[PDB]
């Protein structure tokens, strides 16, 4: 395992998180520093440090994060829409080196996206 980051600790259930959905290969949970009325993350259980090092073999898994994200969004009542975000590196503002998909909604999201 899950990796040497705080998201690894969350996957291993070593520290608490408000879990929305789990399966054998990913976990969705509310972000601890929410930027919208609904703001959650979907992360793979496989430790991929960042999107730039993902491989072709990971394509199904990455797509799974997005499908889980959109299903969780529907379940959380985000019927007016939402925004998904993946941050990479310094310029991307990536805060934890474990791949994570942000899903934000419950308010108008603006442009540019940061």
Q: Which residues bind ligand WSA (CB under 6 A)?
A: 6, 17, 31-33, 41, 87, 93-96, 111
What are the backbone dihedrals phi and psi of residue 62, each rounded to the nearest 5 degrees, phi first? -65, -40
Among a second copy, ligand WSA, none, the one that 90 touches (CB under a kind-dependent 5 to 8 A) is a second copy
Distances in whole angstroms, Cα of residue 73 to Cα of each of 27, 30, 103, 113: 14, 11, 8, 19
If the CB atoms of residues 54 and 96 are measured against a second copy, the closer one turns out to be 54
Annotated binding residue 93? yes
If the CB atoms of residues 31 and 44 are measured against ligand WSA, the closer one turns out to be 31
What are the backbone dihedrals phi and psi of residue 70, each rounded to the nearest 5 degrees, phi first? -70, -35
Active site residues: 100
């Amino acid at each position: 395992p899950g990796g040497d980051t705080i998201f690894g600790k969350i996957i291993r259930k070593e520290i608490p998180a408000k879990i929305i959905f789990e399966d054998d290969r990913c976990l969705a949970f509310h972000d601890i520093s929410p930027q919208a009325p609904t703001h959650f993350l979907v992360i793979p259980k496989k430790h991929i440090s960042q999107i730039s090092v993902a491989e072709d073999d990971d394509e199904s898994l990455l797509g799974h994060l997005m499908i889980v994200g959109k299903k969780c969004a529907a379940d959380l009542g985000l019927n007016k829409g939402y925004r998904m975000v993946v941050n990479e590196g310094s310029d991307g503002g990536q805060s934890v080196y474990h791949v994570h998909l942000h899903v934000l909604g419950g308010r108008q999201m603006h442009w540019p996206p940061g």
